[PDB]
Amino acid sequence: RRGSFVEMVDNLRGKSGQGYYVEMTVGSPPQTLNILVDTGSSNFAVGAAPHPFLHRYYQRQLSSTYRDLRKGVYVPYTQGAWAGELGTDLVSIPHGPNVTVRANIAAITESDKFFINGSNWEGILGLAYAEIARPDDSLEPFFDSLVKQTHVPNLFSLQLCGAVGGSMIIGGIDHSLYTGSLWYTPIRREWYYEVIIVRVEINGQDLKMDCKEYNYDKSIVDSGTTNLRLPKKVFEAAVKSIKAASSTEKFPDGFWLGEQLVCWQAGTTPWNIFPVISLYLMGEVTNQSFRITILPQQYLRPVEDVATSQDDCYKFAISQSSTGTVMGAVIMEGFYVVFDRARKRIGFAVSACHVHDEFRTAAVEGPFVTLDMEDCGYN
Ligand SMILES: C[C@@H](NC(=O)c1cc(C(=O)N[C@@H](Cc2ccccc2)[C@H](O)[C@@H]2NC(C)(C)N(C)C2=O)cc(N(C)S(C)(=O)=O)c1)c1ccc(F)cc1
């Protein structure tokens, strides 16, 4: 219940729900920048040239400790891409661990639909493993450098508080960030933070899909992705069930596709008419699983108000994917997520800051009995 990690609490910020970022200071003399926390990629990169959406950027000529690697780097994402130049420099996180390391850094010189207007972040911290780093797995990711060069335990945890703030505890866990117990699911393979979903329920009702469909291709935990993205067949079945569950009100088809949004008079959003969604994850013991449950407050996201108006507009943030399940911010904002790399597992617990109402709350419950969970994974 105590807190030796107090200085790392509340070290994350967000602007109009456009990405959670932490301050990172690079080079010498110090150059501090706002960096997006992304567990869905593995490259540490910072804007290094003027751009319409950037307030500031990394100026390598001003850093005496900058070391040019003489190699270009290109990183394409689901949304956007950028080109840059590799090098290494001293990096520290003011509100993170009390250490300084020399890490690889990609200086972003050109980009397309990457930076987001008004987001206040100027770079990205890829927290996933080396296998997915660009140009290749020989480019050591920032966290790997942190663990190799210092005594910091191989583990970090994220509390993303939606509507924007949060905490990234590096090297441990802070008990003030969650309630109840922490439940762990294994990290299937160390590339993306891959996990295995064994069952899906909408308002306690089993979607009844073969679990292989839930992980077709893969299922990952990705703080760099806004939505809960699901494979085509899963998406369709989920929307069908969600619509049936919230039949007390009808919405245009475009709403469920994220193309149309619906607004309610400030403070009147009928959260109660929307169902809860539960994802069962493989547990750490044979045939044992647990489930995490989110509320409509997590999958219905606010859209930057017109100008402090009397209308709360929302977008349905569950969408389709062709590269597996992506448990993005809509999932993470309901919990305190522990990325226990040391023990190859990811923990989930109810977040002390998740958005809810006086009738329902996000939950993490278990254990449950689920047979043949191993077969749910894709090979
Ligand atoms: C900051 C912002 N991100 C987005 O608005 C975004 C980024 C990616 C993305 O590609 N994320 C990658 C990182 C990235 C790209 C561009 C800008 C910032 C960050 C991420 O690496 C992603 N992981 C996987 C492995 C899926 N992949 C291939 C990626 O590119 C995908 C989507 N979708 C397609 S969506 C509408 O959510 O279905 C949206 C955001 C806003 C609020 C949050 F609360 C958390 C993150």
Tab-separated table of C-alpha atoms and ligand atoms in Angstrom:
chain	number	residue	atom	x	y	z
A	1	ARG	CA	0.000	0.000	0.000
A	2	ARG	CA	3.045	2.257	0.454
A	3	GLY	CA	4.990	3.938	-2.343
A	4	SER	CA	8.746	4.078	-2.844
A	5	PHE	CA	7.990	4.776	-6.570
A	6	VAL	CA	5.981	7.961	-5.727
A	7	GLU	CA	8.054	10.192	-8.015
A	8	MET	CA	7.029	8.170	-11.049
A	9	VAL	CA	3.290	8.423	-10.257
A	10	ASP	CA	1.417	10.782	-12.581
A	11	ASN	CA	4.379	11.066	-14.967
A	12	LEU	CA	2.167	10.618	-18.075
A	13	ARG	CA	0.051	13.225	-19.855
A	14	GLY	CA	-2.321	13.352	-22.809
A	15	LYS	CA	-3.857	16.077	-24.988
A	16	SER	CA	-7.453	15.472	-26.057
A	17	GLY	CA	-6.936	11.712	-25.910
A	18	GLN	CA	-4.334	11.765	-28.681
A	19	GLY	CA	-1.661	9.623	-27.008
A	20	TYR	CA	-0.061	9.127	-23.604
A	21	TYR	CA	3.428	10.603	-23.348
A	22	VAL	CA	6.261	10.830	-20.861
A	23	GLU	CA	9.123	13.340	-20.708
A	24	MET	CA	12.523	12.090	-21.822
A	25	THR	CA	15.720	14.117	-21.819
A	26	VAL	CA	18.279	13.403	-24.491
A	27	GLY	CA	21.739	14.671	-25.338
A	28	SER	CA	23.995	17.138	-23.578
A	29	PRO	CA	23.339	19.831	-22.706
A	30	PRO	CA	19.787	18.528	-21.907
A	31	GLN	CA	17.049	18.467	-24.514
A	32	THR	CA	13.711	17.371	-23.042
A	33	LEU	CA	10.927	16.133	-25.329
A	34	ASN	CA	7.434	14.660	-24.870
A	35	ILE	CA	7.542	10.991	-25.961
A	36	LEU	CA	4.546	8.756	-26.771
A	37	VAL	CA	4.555	5.462	-24.835
A	38	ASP	CA	4.065	2.642	-27.359
A	39	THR	CA	4.115	-1.012	-26.313
A	40	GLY	CA	3.169	-1.821	-29.945
A	41	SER	CA	6.576	-1.061	-31.515
A	42	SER	CA	10.283	-1.231	-30.638
A	43	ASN	CA	12.008	1.908	-31.940
A	44	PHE	CA	12.830	4.974	-29.909
A	45	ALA	CA	12.511	7.938	-32.290
A	46	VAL	CA	12.183	11.694	-31.985
A	47	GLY	CA	11.258	14.484	-34.331
A	48	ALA	CA	14.552	16.104	-35.327
A	49	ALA	CA	13.434	18.745	-37.824
A	50	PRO	CA	10.698	21.371	-37.922
A	51	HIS	CA	7.187	20.106	-38.636
A	52	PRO	CA	3.781	21.916	-38.563
A	53	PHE	CA	2.574	19.780	-35.639
A	54	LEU	CA	5.806	19.928	-33.610
A	55	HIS	CA	6.464	22.562	-30.957
A	56	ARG	CA	10.044	21.382	-30.449
A	57	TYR	CA	12.506	18.848	-31.781
A	58	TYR	CA	15.828	17.150	-31.226
A	59	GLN	CA	18.843	19.191	-32.457
A	60	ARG	CA	21.729	16.799	-32.810
A	61	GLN	CA	24.335	19.457	-33.627
A	62	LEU	CA	23.757	20.922	-30.132
A	63	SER	CA	24.465	17.588	-28.377
A	64	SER	CA	28.142	16.938	-27.757
A	65	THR	CA	27.444	13.314	-26.828
A	66	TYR	CA	25.522	12.493	-30.007
A	67	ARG	CA	27.097	9.654	-32.008
A	68	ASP	CA	26.074	9.236	-35.672
A	69	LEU	CA	25.544	5.607	-36.722
A	70	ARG	CA	25.578	6.492	-40.436
A	71	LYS	CA	22.470	4.475	-41.226
A	72	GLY	CA	18.990	5.348	-42.326
A	73	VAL	CA	15.856	3.914	-40.729
A	74	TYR	CA	12.257	3.694	-41.922
A	75	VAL	CA	9.326	2.628	-39.782
A	76	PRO	CA	5.843	2.059	-41.167
A	77	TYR	CA	2.906	1.758	-38.753
A	78	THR	CA	-0.756	0.853	-39.122
A	79	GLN	CA	-1.324	4.577	-39.079
A	80	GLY	CA	1.436	6.616	-40.679
A	81	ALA	CA	5.194	6.228	-41.150
A	82	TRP	CA	8.488	8.150	-40.852
A	83	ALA	CA	12.015	8.219	-42.148
A	84	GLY	CA	15.058	9.156	-40.132
A	85	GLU	CA	18.708	8.700	-39.235
A	86	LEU	CA	20.170	6.446	-36.558
A	87	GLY	CA	22.603	7.386	-33.832
A	88	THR	CA	23.103	7.052	-30.077
A	89	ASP	CA	22.996	9.565	-27.258
A	90	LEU	CA	22.513	9.892	-23.502
A	91	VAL	CA	18.927	9.451	-22.409
A	92	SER	CA	17.227	9.876	-19.038
A	93	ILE	CA	13.605	10.053	-17.923
A	94	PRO	CA	13.201	12.925	-15.375
A	95	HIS	CA	10.178	11.341	-13.779
A	96	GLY	CA	11.329	7.806	-14.360
A	97	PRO	CA	14.320	5.795	-13.045
A	98	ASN	CA	17.252	7.681	-11.535
A	99	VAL	CA	19.714	6.534	-14.176
A	100	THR	CA	21.154	7.633	-17.532
A	101	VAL	CA	21.938	5.299	-20.436
A	102	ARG	CA	23.318	5.524	-23.955
A	103	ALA	CA	20.570	4.300	-26.258
A	104	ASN	CA	19.823	4.088	-29.934
A	105	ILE	CA	17.819	7.034	-31.216
A	106	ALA	CA	16.193	7.577	-34.569
A	107	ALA	CA	16.177	11.202	-35.569
A	108	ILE	CA	12.925	11.685	-37.531
A	109	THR	CA	13.585	13.929	-40.524
A	110	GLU	CA	10.462	13.267	-42.631
A	111	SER	CA	7.080	11.720	-41.911
A	112	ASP	CA	3.622	11.056	-43.246
A	113	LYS	CA	0.499	11.061	-41.081
A	114	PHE	CA	2.566	10.179	-38.005
A	115	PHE	CA	2.625	13.237	-35.801
A	116	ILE	CA	-0.780	14.360	-34.574
A	117	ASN	CA	-1.832	17.992	-34.500
A	118	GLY	CA	-2.307	19.181	-30.925
A	119	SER	CA	-1.149	15.930	-29.281
A	120	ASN	CA	1.830	17.647	-27.607
A	121	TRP	CA	4.173	14.672	-28.189
A	122	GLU	CA	7.265	14.881	-30.400
A	123	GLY	CA	8.579	11.323	-30.468
A	124	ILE	CA	7.776	7.689	-29.741
A	125	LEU	CA	9.170	5.130	-27.287
A	126	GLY	CA	8.882	1.620	-28.676
A	127	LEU	CA	8.674	-0.629	-25.618
A	128	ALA	CA	8.300	-4.003	-27.376
A	129	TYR	CA	11.094	-6.487	-28.198
A	130	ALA	CA	14.018	-6.449	-30.610
A	131	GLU	CA	12.505	-8.912	-33.089
A	132	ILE	CA	10.254	-6.184	-34.505
A	133	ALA	CA	12.762	-3.291	-34.452
A	134	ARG	CA	13.805	-1.575	-37.693
A	135	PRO	CA	16.123	-1.885	-39.590
A	136	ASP	CA	16.428	-5.259	-37.826
A	137	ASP	CA	16.678	-7.005	-34.474
A	138	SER	CA	20.270	-5.890	-33.994
A	139	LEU	CA	19.043	-2.366	-33.115
A	140	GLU	CA	18.698	-2.739	-29.370
A	141	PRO	CA	15.411	-1.211	-28.120
A	142	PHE	CA	15.510	1.438	-25.367
A	143	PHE	CA	14.279	-0.832	-22.542
A	144	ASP	CA	16.783	-3.525	-23.367
A	145	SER	CA	19.532	-0.870	-23.055
A	146	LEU	CA	18.087	0.310	-19.741
A	147	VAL	CA	18.113	-3.199	-18.260
A	148	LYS	CA	21.579	-4.123	-19.655
A	149	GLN	CA	23.315	-0.917	-18.500
A	150	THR	CA	21.682	-0.429	-15.119
A	151	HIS	CA	20.272	-2.250	-12.127
A	152	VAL	CA	16.648	-1.348	-13.022
A	153	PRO	CA	14.477	-4.528	-12.836
A	154	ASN	CA	13.246	-5.873	-16.175
A	155	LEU	CA	9.682	-4.661	-15.725
A	156	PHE	CA	7.453	-1.633	-16.209
A	157	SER	CA	3.780	-0.945	-15.645
A	158	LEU	CA	1.211	1.388	-17.155
A	159	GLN	CA	-1.845	3.100	-15.787
A	160	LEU	CA	-3.517	5.003	-18.564
A	161	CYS	CA	-6.215	7.265	-17.190
A	162	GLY	CA	-8.719	8.178	-19.865
A	163	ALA	CA	-11.440	10.816	-19.896
A	164	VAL	CA	-5.730	12.775	-19.611
A	165	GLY	CA	-2.948	11.479	-17.406
A	166	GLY	CA	-1.419	8.314	-16.026
A	167	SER	CA	1.661	6.600	-14.646
A	168	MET	CA	4.500	4.587	-16.056
A	169	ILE	CA	6.291	2.896	-13.206
A	170	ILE	CA	9.690	1.754	-14.365
A	171	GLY	CA	11.386	-1.076	-12.521
A	172	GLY	CA	8.399	-1.980	-10.377
A	173	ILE	CA	4.784	-1.635	-9.339
A	174	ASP	CA	2.977	0.952	-7.231
A	175	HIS	CA	0.019	-0.431	-5.264
A	176	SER	CA	-1.846	2.891	-5.196
A	177	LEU	CA	-2.528	2.535	-8.949
A	178	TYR	CA	-4.937	-0.410	-8.618
A	179	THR	CA	-7.504	-2.191	-6.465
A	180	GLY	CA	-8.146	-5.885	-6.061
A	181	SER	CA	-5.640	-8.483	-7.238
A	182	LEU	CA	-3.307	-8.640	-10.191
A	183	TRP	CA	-3.975	-11.468	-12.634
A	184	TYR	CA	-1.318	-12.624	-15.055
A	185	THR	CA	-1.424	-13.982	-18.559
A	186	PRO	CA	1.691	-15.386	-20.220
A	187	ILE	CA	3.605	-13.498	-22.880
A	188	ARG	CA	3.410	-16.119	-25.645
A	189	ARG	CA	6.402	-14.877	-27.641
A	190	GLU	CA	8.802	-11.996	-27.156
A	191	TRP	CA	8.294	-9.760	-30.222
A	192	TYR	CA	5.069	-7.832	-29.708
A	193	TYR	CA	3.594	-8.306	-26.248
A	194	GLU	CA	1.632	-11.339	-27.437
A	195	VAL	CA	-1.081	-12.905	-25.355
A	196	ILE	CA	-3.856	-15.446	-25.834
A	197	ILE	CA	-7.575	-14.716	-25.615
A	198	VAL	CA	-9.612	-17.846	-24.839
A	199	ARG	CA	-13.184	-16.548	-24.570
A	200	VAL	CA	-15.216	-13.453	-25.293
A	201	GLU	CA	-18.464	-12.358	-23.682
A	202	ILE	CA	-20.833	-9.476	-24.264
A	203	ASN	CA	-22.908	-8.835	-21.148
A	204	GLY	CA	-22.079	-12.292	-19.819
A	205	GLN	CA	-23.117	-13.846	-23.129
A	206	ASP	CA	-20.534	-16.037	-24.824
A	207	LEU	CA	-19.813	-14.913	-28.378
A	208	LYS	CA	-19.377	-18.647	-29.074
A	209	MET	CA	-16.559	-18.389	-31.601
A	210	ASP	CA	-13.762	-20.895	-31.812
A	211	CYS	CA	-11.023	-19.306	-29.705
A	212	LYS	CA	-8.563	-19.669	-32.648
A	213	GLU	CA	-10.559	-16.833	-34.341
A	214	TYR	CA	-9.792	-14.456	-31.424
A	215	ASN	CA	-6.059	-14.839	-31.971
A	216	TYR	CA	-5.981	-15.469	-35.706
A	217	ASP	CA	-2.613	-14.262	-36.586
A	218	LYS	CA	-2.015	-12.861	-33.093
A	219	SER	CA	-3.347	-10.877	-30.102
A	220	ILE	CA	-1.196	-8.123	-28.582
A	221	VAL	CA	-1.244	-5.419	-25.878
A	222	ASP	CA	-0.569	-2.115	-27.638
A	223	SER	CA	-0.623	1.278	-25.876
A	224	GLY	CA	0.200	2.961	-29.229
A	225	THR	CA	-3.156	1.955	-30.734
A	226	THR	CA	-6.321	3.756	-29.724
A	227	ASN	CA	-8.949	1.068	-30.404
A	228	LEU	CA	-9.693	-2.484	-29.466
A	229	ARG	CA	-9.104	-3.951	-32.926
A	230	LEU	CA	-10.520	-7.364	-33.799
A	231	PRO	CA	-10.179	-9.808	-36.721
A	232	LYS	CA	-12.938	-9.349	-39.330
A	233	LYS	CA	-15.051	-12.381	-38.373
A	234	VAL	CA	-14.721	-11.508	-34.659
A	235	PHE	CA	-15.558	-7.850	-35.232
A	236	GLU	CA	-18.748	-8.712	-37.101
A	237	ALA	CA	-19.929	-11.159	-34.473
A	238	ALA	CA	-19.100	-8.687	-31.679
A	239	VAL	CA	-20.965	-5.754	-33.270
A	240	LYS	CA	-23.972	-7.990	-33.906
A	241	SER	CA	-24.046	-8.995	-30.215
A	242	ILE	CA	-23.395	-5.480	-28.911
A	243	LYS	CA	-26.228	-4.076	-31.067
A	244	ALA	CA	-28.584	-6.775	-29.807
A	245	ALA	CA	-27.571	-6.015	-26.219
A	246	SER	CA	-28.213	-2.266	-26.608
A	247	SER	CA	-31.428	-2.568	-28.620
A	248	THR	CA	-33.220	-0.063	-26.316
A	249	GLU	CA	-31.748	2.553	-28.700
A	250	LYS	CA	-30.923	2.243	-32.381
A	251	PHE	CA	-27.912	3.786	-34.092
A	252	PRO	CA	-26.902	4.176	-37.733
A	253	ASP	CA	-24.663	1.452	-39.166
A	254	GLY	CA	-21.901	4.008	-39.570
A	255	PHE	CA	-21.759	4.469	-35.801
A	256	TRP	CA	-20.624	0.868	-35.309
A	257	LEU	CA	-18.080	1.312	-38.094
A	258	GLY	CA	-16.600	4.412	-36.407
A	259	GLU	CA	-17.605	6.613	-39.355
A	260	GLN	CA	-20.397	8.411	-37.516
A	261	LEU	CA	-20.389	9.630	-33.998
A	262	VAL	CA	-23.279	10.310	-31.635
A	263	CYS	CA	-23.487	13.186	-29.184
A	264	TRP	CA	-25.492	13.542	-25.995
A	265	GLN	CA	-26.303	16.595	-23.917
A	266	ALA	CA	-23.413	17.070	-21.492
A	267	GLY	CA	-23.715	14.629	-18.590
A	268	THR	CA	-26.672	12.643	-19.943
A	269	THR	CA	-24.869	9.812	-21.760
A	270	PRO	CA	-26.937	6.637	-21.069
A	271	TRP	CA	-23.976	4.359	-20.323
A	272	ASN	CA	-26.446	1.864	-18.839
A	273	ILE	CA	-27.930	0.936	-22.259
A	274	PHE	CA	-24.549	-0.312	-23.556
A	275	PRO	CA	-23.151	-3.746	-22.590
A	276	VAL	CA	-19.928	-4.664	-20.847
A	277	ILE	CA	-17.334	-6.646	-22.743
A	278	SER	CA	-15.201	-9.382	-21.243
A	279	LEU	CA	-12.066	-10.947	-22.638
A	280	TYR	CA	-10.838	-14.142	-20.982
A	281	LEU	CA	-7.075	-14.549	-21.068
A	282	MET	CA	-4.945	-17.623	-20.575
A	283	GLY	CA	-3.789	-17.900	-16.958
A	284	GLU	CA	-0.454	-19.008	-15.487
A	285	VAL	CA	-1.714	-22.441	-14.386
A	286	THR	CA	-2.906	-25.231	-16.685
A	287	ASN	CA	-6.604	-24.961	-17.673
A	288	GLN	CA	-6.981	-21.770	-15.644
A	289	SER	CA	-7.986	-18.380	-17.031
A	290	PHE	CA	-9.269	-15.035	-15.866
A	291	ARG	CA	-11.267	-12.277	-17.481
A	292	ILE	CA	-10.990	-8.550	-17.829
A	293	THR	CA	-14.149	-6.530	-18.307
A	294	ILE	CA	-14.500	-3.063	-19.754
A	295	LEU	CA	-17.405	-0.652	-19.742
A	296	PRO	CA	-18.885	1.484	-22.508
A	297	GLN	CA	-16.963	4.395	-20.983
A	298	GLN	CA	-13.830	2.641	-22.259
A	299	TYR	CA	-14.972	1.653	-25.773
A	300	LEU	CA	-17.002	4.825	-26.432
A	301	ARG	CA	-14.391	7.583	-26.716
A	302	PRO	CA	-14.937	11.362	-26.416
A	303	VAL	CA	-14.229	13.506	-29.472
A	304	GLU	CA	-12.445	16.822	-28.851
A	305	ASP	CA	-15.335	19.149	-28.042
A	306	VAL	CA	-16.308	21.781	-30.621
A	307	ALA	CA	-15.275	24.520	-28.146
A	308	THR	CA	-16.337	23.766	-24.573
A	309	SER	CA	-19.914	23.121	-25.660
A	310	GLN	CA	-22.878	21.421	-24.052
A	311	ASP	CA	-22.494	18.258	-26.130
A	312	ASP	CA	-20.571	15.075	-25.356
A	313	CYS	CA	-19.759	13.444	-28.713
A	314	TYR	CA	-18.506	9.863	-28.866
A	315	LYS	CA	-16.986	7.477	-31.345
A	316	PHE	CA	-17.388	3.688	-31.156
A	317	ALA	CA	-13.767	2.611	-30.660
A	318	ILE	CA	-13.954	-1.095	-31.483
A	319	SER	CA	-12.860	-1.663	-35.080
A	320	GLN	CA	-11.622	-4.279	-37.505
A	321	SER	CA	-8.170	-5.521	-38.255
A	322	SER	CA	-6.485	-7.915	-40.653
A	323	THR	CA	-3.415	-8.503	-38.477
A	324	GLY	CA	-4.973	-10.018	-35.339
A	325	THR	CA	-6.429	-8.627	-32.132
A	326	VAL	CA	-5.022	-5.348	-30.875
A	327	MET	CA	-5.839	-4.549	-27.269
A	328	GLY	CA	-5.192	-0.820	-27.435
A	329	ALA	CA	-6.084	2.091	-25.164
A	330	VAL	CA	-9.784	1.156	-24.985
A	331	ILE	CA	-8.638	-1.965	-23.108
A	332	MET	CA	-5.684	-0.495	-21.181
A	333	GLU	CA	-7.592	2.545	-19.801
A	334	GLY	CA	-9.697	0.227	-17.644
A	335	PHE	CA	-6.700	-1.319	-15.878
A	336	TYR	CA	-3.236	-1.099	-14.386
A	337	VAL	CA	-1.134	-3.216	-16.731
A	338	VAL	CA	2.112	-4.817	-15.581
A	339	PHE	CA	4.605	-5.709	-18.272
A	340	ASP	CA	6.622	-8.235	-16.295
A	341	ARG	CA	9.284	-8.979	-18.866
A	342	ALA	CA	11.417	-10.705	-16.192
A	343	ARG	CA	8.744	-13.371	-15.675
A	344	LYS	CA	7.362	-13.321	-19.256
A	345	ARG	CA	3.873	-12.332	-18.181
A	346	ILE	CA	1.481	-9.428	-18.241
A	347	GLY	CA	-0.598	-8.538	-15.248
A	348	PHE	CA	-3.998	-6.853	-15.144
A	349	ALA	CA	-5.771	-5.283	-12.188
A	350	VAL	CA	-8.619	-2.831	-11.843
A	351	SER	CA	-7.289	0.686	-12.348
A	352	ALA	CA	-7.713	3.176	-9.504
A	353	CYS	CA	-8.358	5.889	-12.136
A	354	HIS	CA	-10.541	4.133	-14.732
A	355	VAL	CA	-13.709	5.900	-15.803
A	356	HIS	CA	-16.953	4.376	-14.546
A	357	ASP	CA	-20.330	5.244	-13.020
A	358	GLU	CA	-22.233	4.502	-9.799
A	359	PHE	CA	-23.709	1.257	-11.197
A	360	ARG	CA	-20.830	-0.564	-12.935
A	361	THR	CA	-17.055	-0.772	-12.794
A	362	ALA	CA	-14.328	-2.411	-14.861
A	363	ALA	CA	-13.240	-5.729	-13.411
A	364	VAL	CA	-10.586	-8.391	-13.425
A	365	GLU	CA	-11.931	-11.651	-12.100
A	366	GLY	CA	-10.918	-15.240	-11.777
A	367	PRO	CA	-10.151	-18.003	-11.802
A	368	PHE	CA	-12.179	-19.837	-14.409
A	369	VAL	CA	-11.780	-23.243	-15.939
A	370	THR	CA	-10.923	-23.264	-19.639
A	371	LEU	CA	-9.679	-26.413	-21.347
A	372	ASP	CA	-7.467	-26.653	-24.443
A	373	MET	CA	-6.270	-23.012	-24.180
A	374	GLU	CA	-2.991	-23.866	-25.907
A	375	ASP	CA	-4.839	-24.687	-29.154
A	376	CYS	CA	-6.248	-21.116	-29.289
A	377	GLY	CA	-2.917	-19.772	-30.515
A	378	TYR	CA	-2.007	-19.444	-34.186
A	379	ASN	CA	0.971	-21.271	-35.694
B	1	LIG	C1	-1.202	8.050	-30.535
B	1	LIG	C2	-2.656	7.593	-30.745
B	1	LIG	N1	-2.687	6.566	-31.780
B	1	LIG	C3	-3.584	6.471	-32.822
B	1	LIG	O1	-4.398	7.373	-33.034
B	1	LIG	C4	-3.502	5.241	-33.643
B	1	LIG	C5	-2.227	4.625	-33.892
B	1	LIG	C6	-2.134	3.359	-34.531
B	1	LIG	C7	-0.836	2.725	-34.752
B	1	LIG	O2	-0.501	2.319	-35.868
B	1	LIG	N2	-0.025	2.614	-33.656
B	1	LIG	C8	1.426	2.340	-33.806
B	1	LIG	C9	2.193	3.506	-33.176
B	1	LIG	C10	1.834	4.914	-33.678
B	1	LIG	C11	1.557	5.243	-35.092
B	1	LIG	C12	1.238	6.612	-35.429
B	1	LIG	C13	1.189	7.611	-34.370
B	1	LIG	C14	1.490	7.310	-32.977
B	1	LIG	C15	1.796	5.929	-32.634
B	1	LIG	C16	1.790	1.007	-33.091
B	1	LIG	O3	3.105	0.773	-33.106
B	1	LIG	C17	1.032	-0.179	-33.777
B	1	LIG	N3	1.341	-1.456	-33.122
B	1	LIG	C18	1.046	-2.412	-34.190
B	1	LIG	C19	1.843	-3.683	-33.929
B	1	LIG	C20	-0.468	-2.730	-34.262
B	1	LIG	N4	1.475	-1.709	-35.415
B	1	LIG	C21	1.827	-2.431	-36.639
B	1	LIG	C22	1.526	-0.392	-35.205
B	1	LIG	O4	1.899	0.407	-36.059
B	1	LIG	C23	-3.329	2.701	-35.004
B	1	LIG	C24	-4.629	3.304	-34.854
B	1	LIG	N5	-5.749	2.626	-35.372
B	1	LIG	C25	-5.712	2.088	-36.771
B	1	LIG	S1	-7.229	2.626	-34.627
B	1	LIG	C26	-8.230	4.011	-35.141
B	1	LIG	O5	-6.984	2.858	-33.232
B	1	LIG	O6	-7.912	1.402	-34.949
B	1	LIG	C27	-4.686	4.580	-34.158
B	1	LIG	C28	-3.238	7.174	-29.446
B	1	LIG	C29	-4.345	8.007	-29.006
B	1	LIG	C30	-4.944	7.701	-27.729
B	1	LIG	C31	-4.372	6.609	-26.982
B	1	LIG	F1	-4.895	6.358	-25.774
B	1	LIG	C32	-3.279	5.753	-27.404
B	1	LIG	C33	-2.707	6.028	-28.689
